Structure formats: C-alpha cells, structure tokens
C-alpha cells in the first residue's frame, strides 16, 4: 500500500562477465559475485558463504541469489565424508561421495581439491565434485580430475564428456591467479 | 582477513535490470547493469525526491563496481539552481529542472508529469543527464512531444538526431521504450 514496484528489463545488449569479491578467513569464506545470466541476458547477484574443516573438507554452504526471477536460497550441510543434507536436515543421497563444491562462475572453488588433496608433482586425482551453477543453484555430482604439474600449476579436467581441460596458475595458498581465458585475479 | 577479487574473461551479452519502488513524492531504485567499456557489472542504488509539481528536489546515488564505491548527492531548488550535499553551488547545471539517468526509463516520467503538454505539443527542456556508472552529470538539450495521453516522442537535441516513441501508462511511467527497455 505504501509504494508500488516497477521493474524494467533492458533490450540493449553489451558483452559482460563476472566480478567476484571474496573475503577469506582460516575456515570460511564469504563472497559477493555479480554476473550475467547467460540465457536471459539479465544480471544476477550471488552471495555465498562456505565453511570447511581443518582438512579443507566442506562442512557448510549457504547461497542467496537475486535475479529478475526472484530470490532463491540454498543451504547445504556436508559431513566431510561424502554425506549431504539440506538445511532442514533431510538427507541428499544423490550427492553421496562428493567432498568438494564447485560453483560456476567462480575460480575460488578450485582451491578446495588443491588444499584438500595435498598432491605431489605429477600426481593425479579423480574427484566427485558437487557442481552448483549460478543462477539456478541446482546441484549435481560431477566427475573431475586434478593433476599437480608443479607447485603453482594444476591441470584441471572434466570427466563427464566435454573433454574440457585447463591449466590453473595458483599462489602458495592455492588461490587461483589465472584461470586462463576464463578468470583473472585483480 | 584476506581479500580476493576475480574478473571474468568470458563474455556473454547482457543488459540492465531495474527494480523501482514508487511513492507519491519519491522513488528508490536498484539497478544492475554492465559497464559498457569494461565488460564488468555494477550496481546503482538511487533515490529521487520531487515536489508536487514533479520538479526534482533531491537525488542520492550509490554505485558499486570493480573500481570501488562512488556516491553523488544533489540538491535542487526546483527553479534550476543546484547544490551538492555539502551546499556548494553547481553553476554548471543552471536551468536544469529534470534529471535523466542512463540506463533508466524511469526518468522520462519527470518531463511528462511536469510539462502538462497538450496533444501535439512539443517542448524543449534542459535535462541534467547522469550516466551510470561514472555519475558525472551534465546539462543536455532534449525535447518531448505529447502525441497522445499514452505516447510521447523523445528527441535528443545535441546532434545525434536520436528519436523515440515512448508508450506510457496512466501515471506517465514507461511501458515500452522501443528497442531499449521493457516493463516486466
């Protein structure tokens, strides 16, 4: 009654991408990510917080996305041993075996397998990642591989059929500097 | 606590999304859009307040982008005399009665509601044009023509010759800005 909402979408288009600002503590991160919906062409903002254990196993994830379609939330709990549940404590068996989350579009999440696995040069690991693509935030299990090439370079590969592969340049804490052609640290 | 910022290198076509809350004498809006040079997103929050004649009296802007936070606070007397939030006079904007914000069709409402044009009637205005994300205002010559109650011809008078026909609702709020904005 006090006010009335009016919403406008632009019809003009310009090329655009993501911008993410993250704050990192020892056992948790909080981030604000802004990016275009790649189907609709309209912007969204994703706010999220991740919390992990001493061994860099994910224990909690909270997401809040705002877009033209409305506000969507997601709350996930993980036991650090591959068992997931929602914020209501309902088990999510479809994610069994996932130890790490991978959020698109964010190169933050590549840090988890790096820090968790502690790979040596030349060592390869195949993982089951819980892949969550903004803005829809509908998680699904995804097979991935990481190979340590040297201290600052990791070979990332999709294992589900795309054959996508990339070499990540990371810093001494395992944070991505360059995700070549996809993300740059500012 | 360590701060980390990443820019995307991938590109996808994008545009503005604006959600505005309107009251009798003021509006507060949240506008998200891409920077048209950098490819990176920004968010503009703004609030406008006007008198009963639809003359702008105050405007406050807050933009967040990869370049940082930028703020702008304008005061107008409704008679074409402007000041910043600290009271310092802004002679460069002398004679402006209306603000025009890009990218927003909201601000087309001001001349429509203020001018009281008859059907077929054209008026030139001096608009204070404020383009996000930089928010560096400048006076600009524009013209409005009432075609009928629900259609106004907009003209840029600075030399582009850009013209548009705006479809508006019963309160002068833009429904269609053809090829630029659509009401959802």
The DSSP string of B19-48 is EEEE-SSEEEEEEEEE-TTT--EEEEEEEE
Residue B118: its H or E element: none
Question: What separation, in Å, do the N-terminal and C-terminal C-alpha atoms of chain B show?
Answer: 41
Resolution (A): 1.8
CB contact under 8 A, A34 and B32: yes
* B29 exposure class (CB count in 10 Å sphere: 0-12, 13-18, 19+): buried
Nearest to A17 among B8, B23, B32 (CB): B8
Closest CA to A134 of A160, A159, A161, A106: A106
Q: Does A6 touch chain B (CB under 8 A)?
A: yes
Residues 147-186 of A with CB under 8 A from B: 175-176, 179, 181-186
| SS3 letters across chain A | CCCEEEEEEECCCEEECCEEEEEECCCEEEEEEEEECCCCCCEEEEEEEEEECCCCCEEEEEEEEEECCEEEEEEEEECCCCCEEECCCCECHHHCCCCEEEEECCCHHHHHHHHHHCCCCCCEEEEEEEEEECCCCCCEEEEEEEEEEECCEEEEEECCCCCCEEEEEECCCCCEEEECCCEEEC
**Residue A94 burial (CB count, 10 A):** 11
In degrees, rounded to 5, the angle at the alpha carbon of residue B101 between the alpha carbons of residues B27 and B138 is: 130
Closest CA to A46 of A71, A29, A24, A77: A71
Each residue of B90-126: b (16+ CB within 10 Å) or e?
beebeebbbbbbebbbbbbbbbbbbbebeeeeeeebb
The DSSP code sequence of B41-60 is: EEEEEEEEEE-TT--EEEEE
Rounded CA separation B173/A14 (Å): 25
Rounded CA separation A175/A152 (Å): 10
Closest CA to B108 of B150, B144, B161: B144
Breaks (C-N over 2.5 A) in chain A follow: none
Rounded CA separation A127/A113 (Å): 8
Rounded CA separation B49/B93 (Å): 18
**Residue B23 burial (CB count, 10 A):** 11
Tell the residue number behind the tokens 């020892």, with chain if given.
A26
Distances (CA, A) of A22 to A30, B6, B23: 6, 9, 36
Q: Which of B2, B7, B14, B33 to mutate to test the interface with A (most CBs of A within 10 A)?
A: B14
Question: Rounded to the nearest 5°, which phi and psi values hold at B93?
Answer: -105, 15
* Interacting residues of B151 by C-beta distance below 8 A, sequence separation 6+: B165, B166, B167, B168
Closest CA to A62 of A91, A38, A32, A35: A32
Q: Which of B4, B7, B30, B175 to mutate to test the interface with A (most CBs of A within 10 A)?
A: B4
Closest CA to B177 of A6, A75, A26, A63: A6
* A130 exposure class (CB count in 10 Å sphere: 0-12, 13-18, 19+): buried
Closest CA to B142 of B108, B176, B173, B170: B108
Distances (CA, A) of A154 to A144, A147, A179, B35: 13, 6, 10, 32
Q: Does A71 touch chain B (CB under 8 A)?
A: no
Interface A-B, measured as beta-carbon pairs within 8 A, has a size of 186
Let me know: does A132 contact A63? Beta carbons within 8 Å: yes
Rounded CA separation A179/A181 (Å): 6
Technique employed here was X-ray
Rounded CA separation B180/A60 (Å): 42
**Residue A10 burial (CB count, 10 A):** 24
Tell the residue number behind the tokens 């402006």, with chain if given.
B96
Q: Which of B3, B5, B7, B8 to mutate to test the interface with A (most CBs of A within 10 A)?
A: B8
Rounded CA separation B182/B105 (Å): 9
Question: Rounded to the nearest 5°, which phi and psi values hold at A170?
Answer: -125, 160
Each residue of A28-59: b (16+ CB within 10 Å) or e?
ebbbbbbbbbeebbbbbbbebebbbeeebbbe
Question: Rounded to the nearest 5°, which phi and psi values hold at B114?
Answer: -80, -45
Rounded CA separation B5/A20 (Å): 6
Q: Does A41 touch chain B (CB under 8 A)?
A: yes
Residue B127: its H or E element: strand B122-131
Q: Does B139 touch chain A (CB under 8 A)?
A: no
A135 interaction partners in chain B (CB closer than 8 Å): none
Let me know: does A45 contact A37? Beta carbons within 8 Å: no
Q: Does B111 touch chain A (CB under 8 A)?
A: no
Nearest-CA distance B37 → chain A (Å): 9
Q: Rounded to the nearest 10 degrees, how much is the dihedral formed by the CA atoms of B87, B55, A3, A37?
A: -80
Let me know: does A134 contact A74? Beta carbons within 8 Å: no
Nearest-CA distance B126 → chain A (Å): 25
Nearest to A6 among B7, B22, B40 (CB): B22
Sign of CA dihedral A35, A39, A41, A47: negative
Closest CA to A110 of A66, A71, A161, A166: A166
């Amino acid at each position: 009654s006090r006010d009335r909402l009016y919403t406008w979408a632009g019809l003009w288009r310009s090329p655009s991408s993501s911008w993410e600002a993250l704050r990192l503590e020892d056992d948790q991160a909080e981030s604000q990510l802004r990016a275009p919906d790649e189907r609709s062409g309209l912007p969204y903002q994703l706010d999220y917080r991740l919390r992990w254990d001493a061994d860099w196993h994910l224990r909690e994830a909270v997401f809040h996305v705002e877009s033209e379609t409305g506000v969507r939330k997601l709350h996930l709990l993980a036991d650090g041993r591959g068992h997931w549940q929602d914020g209501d404590g309902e088990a999510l068996p479809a994610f069994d075996g996932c130890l790490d989350i991978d959020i698109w579009p964010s190169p933050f999440t590549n840090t988890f397998p790096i820090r968790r696995l502690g790979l040596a040069d030349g060592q390869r690991a195949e993982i089951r990642a819980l892949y969550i693509e903004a803005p829809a935030l509908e998680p699904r299990s995804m097979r991935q591989a990481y190979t340590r090439l040297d201290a600052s370079h990791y070979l990332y590969e999709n294992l589900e059929g795309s054959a996508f592969k990339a070499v990540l340049l990371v810093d001494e804490q395992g944070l991505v500097i360059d995700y070549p052609g996809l993300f740059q640290r500012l």
